[PDB]
Write a protein that binds this ligand. Sequence first.
Ligand SMILES: CCCCCCCCCCCCCCCCCCCCCCCCCC(=O)N[C@@H](CO[C@H]1O[C@H](CO)[C@H](O)[C@H](O)[C@H]1O)[C@H](O)[C@H](O)CCCCCCCCCCCCCC
Ligand SMILES: *[C@@H]1O[C@H](CO)[C@@H](O[C@@H]2O[C@H](CO)[C@@H](O)[C@H](O)[C@H]2NC(C)=O)[C@H](O)[C@H]1NC(C)=O
Ligand SMILES: *[C@@H]1O[C@H](CO)[C@@H](O)[C@H](O)[C@H]1NC(C)=O
Ligand SMILES: *[C@@H]1O[C@H](CO)[C@@H](O)[C@H](O)[C@H]1NC(C)=O
Lengths: 286, 203, 99, 236
Amino acid sequence: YTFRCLQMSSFANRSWSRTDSVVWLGDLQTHRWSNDSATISFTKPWSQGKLSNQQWEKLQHMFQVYRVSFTRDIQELVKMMSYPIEIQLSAGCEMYPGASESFLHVAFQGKYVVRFWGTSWQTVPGAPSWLDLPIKVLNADQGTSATVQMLLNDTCPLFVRGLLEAGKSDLEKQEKPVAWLSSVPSSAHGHRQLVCHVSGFYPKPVWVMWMRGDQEQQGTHRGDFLPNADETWYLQATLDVEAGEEAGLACRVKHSSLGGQDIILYWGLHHILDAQKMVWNHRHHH
Amino acid sequence: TQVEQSPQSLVVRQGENSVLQCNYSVTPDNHLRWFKQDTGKGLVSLTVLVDQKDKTSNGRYSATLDKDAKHSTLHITATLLDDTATYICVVGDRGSALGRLHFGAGTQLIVIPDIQNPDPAVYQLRDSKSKSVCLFTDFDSQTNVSQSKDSDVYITDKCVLDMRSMDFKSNSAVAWSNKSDFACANAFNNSIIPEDTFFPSPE
Amino acid sequence: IQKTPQIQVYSRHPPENGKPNILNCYVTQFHPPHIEIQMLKNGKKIPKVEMSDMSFSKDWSFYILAHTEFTPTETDTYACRVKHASMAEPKTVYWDRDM
Amino acid sequence: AVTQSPRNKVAVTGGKVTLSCNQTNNHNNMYWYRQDTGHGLRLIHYSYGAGSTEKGDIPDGYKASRPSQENFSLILELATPSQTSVYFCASGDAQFFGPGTRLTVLEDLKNVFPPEVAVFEPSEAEISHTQKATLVCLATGFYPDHVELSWWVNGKEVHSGVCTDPQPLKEQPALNDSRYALSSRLRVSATFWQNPRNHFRCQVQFYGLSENDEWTQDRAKPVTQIVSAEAWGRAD
Ligand SMILES: CCCCCCCCCCCCCCCCCCCCCCCCCC(=O)N[C@@H](CO[C@H]1O[C@H](CO)[C@H](O)[C@H](O)[C@H]1O)[C@H](O)[C@H](O)CCCCCCCCCCCCCC
Ligand SMILES: *[C@@H]1O[C@H](CO)[C@@H](O[C@@H]2O[C@H](CO)[C@@H](O)[C@H](O)[C@H]2NC(C)=O)[C@H](O)[C@H]1NC(C)=O
Ligand SMILES: *[C@@H]1O[C@H](CO)[C@@H](O)[C@H](O)[C@H]1NC(C)=O
Ligand SMILES: *[C@@H]1O[C@H](CO)[C@@H](O)[C@H](O)[C@H]1NC(C)=O
């Protein structure tokens, strides 16, 4: 389970800027913090973990000052290093079964430039040389360094471990996939691309293949894992066959939420009927 | 106005201890610095306080910091006449070059000399070039000199005079008038003067 | 560098003509993160569109999720229209259930 | 470390005034504050290195410039009464402060005057009563209050037994353009004053107009000058 705090900061000019961030434990969103807002918002009932109303308030205020501070710093760094500017900051820890490890990566205009490593900021190999001075300035602050180290070394792992027992439930929830078939013209003359749509499954790991009874098709392509709004997943597995060779193919879906009982969709009664309920005029088709 | 200093002006007997208060609301508060400003010259650093509950010492100077209360005090042990300056509290909002300094309006510390034997007297002095002044002098620094409640008459403030040759010190104030009929006897009767004050006749 | 967005339109449940459903528009791989996403039924905007908060991948590029409540037909069209600094004209990608 | 020039300056409304800072410390960050009673220092303009310049909290009326690591000028294009202050530049990464510049901007140069200086001889009564003798110096009728006062004995500046008021005082407290006066005391032993061989000189340095200042008025030009009065000892 990888826990990441993700910060988005935009600087349009000297006077206008905003910063927004969100927090992910695994693929679940736990917090959100908008520029419009004073405080960090929970997106789960258990987002506080095992910290107490006092402990969290202190950690919150800590962040509240940071956000104001980070803002003025960068504006000043820019006056030093003679807009528009985008900064991205990713920090957290990947929990091992032990034990763990931490990270605080910073990106500038889309590129990965700085990390916090050991007791200070350093520029990542192959970084621009103008950043040397800003890092020299930023490393002269003992106070930030101290608080950042505690955050990474002690505070972050002790927090996440709180979430993993508090969100025991929502993390180990199971959701059954629902699949359906369809096909589209291939890019090749007289071939057909067949689609097996799989939707609404959690957790993420899943097995989808095109079969011919025994032999699973080697031309089976797995698409990207796309998200649903309700924290479930979407995948499609496609197969290119020469038109008139669809007959005898089957989509097979293996996922932990079913147990032993797969979804085996055959190309041809069940199929025919579902293809009738999704008919349309085919504008526009790509 | 995030850094406020207390008290506004302080007055101590030469040899005694003096306490100076500083309250700030600057956020964040990385460090707090005390400066001395010798009237006419620039600022000069005495001490810095960093930790959440810090306490430093620069010989006779000693300072304390309490961030939880956002408060610092500067103590001076065995004040000297040299200590007559303005003391300025400055707070820094970062631990690096990017920080802004936040200055207090300062505390004005006047260190009055001790005078074990006064000789209160007012003398008339005549101009070396062919006009006179009145010199009020050798009173103790328990006396204050009021400024003239008269149009044409001028009176100065207390001034401390150190003859380091003999380690003898005295206070003095000059009054003069454009007007002719100006006796020295009634020149400082704007102030409360000691019962022993020596008024020599000029006639 | 100024990365250009990719648009993906897909439904939450198997599409059944005349049955309540949700349409997802996932926009990815763009830069800078300022973006404007509208969803259109028959070329006109939709009154209620829910957005997710924005994030980015391990490759630092931004993604976001727009979704709307809809019931499909044989005749009705649905598209996702994106405005962004890397495009001179706004891109429009129509829903294609067969994809 | 940190040098400033000039130390005293007198301007007219609408004149140009450059204030020069210089540092041999090799720092990057240079600052310009101004000091006024009840305020604490206030940032006008600051700098991160050669060729860079920045607005402080109160930069209105001021352009700054940093030609090199070493020098940081504050420029006043159109001087105004409001800009009467004491200015400090500082160098460093936090800071180290210069000895300050005192500037006055006046509505008109018409009322600027040098001091008249006079020494008053020690009272006989004081000699008999205390065995000590106090000379008293008196600088009068000068405007504005930019004066430095020293005591000189036998051709060498003394500090022992010297006094000067902290403040000048207005010769007419009610009037706003009033002239100023500053007193100073020098006390020595009777027998030291009773020696005719001894020489006493009061010196007042006054800051006024410079080389390139237009003066069309009738009276003598109230330039930056030294005015002195003097006395010798006597057995009587
Ligand atoms: C971080 C992992 C821990 C996570 C566990 C908690 C989970 C709870 C979830 C809540 C959601 C959180 C929102 C997500 C936020 C993203 C996390 C990123 C962490 C950032 C580290 C925070 C730094 C903390 C120290 C700080 O506030 N510094 C402040 C205040 O410091 C001042 O005040 C202090 C006391 O208040 C001290 O006195 C200090 O000496 C003084 O200077 C200081 O001003 C820092 O300089 C601010 C910047 C810090 C980040 C640097 C960014 C990298 C540099 C970019 C380079 C490119 C620029 C070139 C153009
Ligand atoms: C947090 O952990 C880091 C890494 O162990 C410590 O920081 C330094 O680690 C580097 C190697 O990356 C060493 O070379 C340094 O000497 C370490 N610093 C110190 C102070 O020894 C860091 O000390 C830890 N922080 C805390 C407070 O626990
Ligand atoms: C700063 O930039 C944004 C453009 O994204 C604009 O809305 C704002 O008005 C700008 N401010 C200035 C200084 O013009
Ligand atoms: C972001 O928030 C700050 C206050 O925390 C505000 O000053 C700034 O104007 C905001 N930017 C906008 C309008 O997006």
